[PDB]
Design a protein around this ligand. Structure first.
Ligand SMILES: O=C(O)c1cc(Br)ccc1N[C@H]1CCC[C@@H](C(=O)O)C1
Ligand SMILES: O=C(O)c1cc(Br)ccc1N[C@H]1CCC[C@@H](C(=O)O)C1
Lengths: 158, 157
């Protein structure tokens, strides 16, 4: 039904989608201003780590400061194969994508990193309140020359 | 309010019920979870230490796989289940937790807990493709496997 309230939900979803698109296409020195897409208290970061705990970057300013490090350590990064999923919540989206680029972490050799990613984006007032990255840390270990632990699944049917 | 749209709404509602039922399947009922899939339906684990998915292809293979899964994760429960519909009536995402004993050949019995994302795509009201995404490091830990620590030298606080 075409009511003011359904219309408002559609408008919000449409706006938020454009910000997801923008986020996912932000490259190069533009990454130094990606933080401006977030609420002042917005959070971003990596939810799949070797320690099992997220690394959460809290606050728009902290995200901007973080961008300096990310641009250093992933100097040519691009997201590819981007699929945006709207949800029943006009303020929540998921993205499935791939990503590739050099990885330049001090203490490791320079390497090439490729992974499969899921990102979660939650909005408030048309800015991102929470972004979260989910990936397979093992592919990052590979890129850094770190030996990947192996699980044997004996008896797993074929 | 158009038949195209009434059809999609119905398909999405039907498919959501199937996602709910999959997520709440426990115990011996797991031996029949494969009945939720198309005959050629695929399920499995998309985040593995090898970097390649472990795909289980076909309804019959998924039922055979259930035997293994019930032995290796004998009391498994999904919890904190959040179901995301999408613009596609035939594609859902689930974010949840899961926990239970892990009992793999050649590793000490453990307690495995993880955070999960599942993707479910549908055809003809049955699951055509289910994919699990988790952090393999938590599964290493549950099996007593040492996990390396990545150092992020510049990383601000
Ligand atoms: O992979 C990490 O070590 C990582 C650590 C924190 Br903490 C946050 C995010 C992380 N993932 C990267 C992957 C490459 C692009 C990059 C970006 O888009 O800023 C983010
Ligand atoms: O974690 C694995 O080793 C794994 C291997 C393949 Br092959 C497929 C799925 C896997 N994940 C489990 C996690 C516990 C519940 C279980 C189930 O719901 O059947 C599936």
């Amino acid at each position: 039904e075409n009511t003011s309230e359904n219309r408002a939900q559609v408008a919000a979803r449409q706006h938020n989608r454009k910000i997801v698109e923008q986020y996912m296409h932000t490259r190069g020195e533009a990454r130094l201003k990606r933080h401006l897409l977030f609420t002042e208290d917005g959070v971003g970061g990596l939810w799949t780590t070797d320690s099992g705990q997220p690394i959460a970057i809290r606050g728009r300013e902290k995200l901007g400061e973080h961008a300096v490090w990310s641009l250093q350590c992933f100097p040519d990064w691009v997201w590819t194969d981007i699929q945006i999923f709207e949800t029943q919540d006009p303020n929540w989206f998921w993205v499935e994508c791939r990503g590739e680029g050099a990885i330049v972490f001090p203490g490791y050799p320079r390497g090439q990193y490729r992974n499969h990613f899921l990102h979660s984006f939650r909005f408030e007032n048309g800015l991102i309140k929470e972004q979260r990255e989910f990936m397979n840390p093992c592919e990052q270990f590979r890129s850094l020359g770190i030996e990947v632990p192996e699980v044997r699944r004996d008896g797993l049917p074929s």
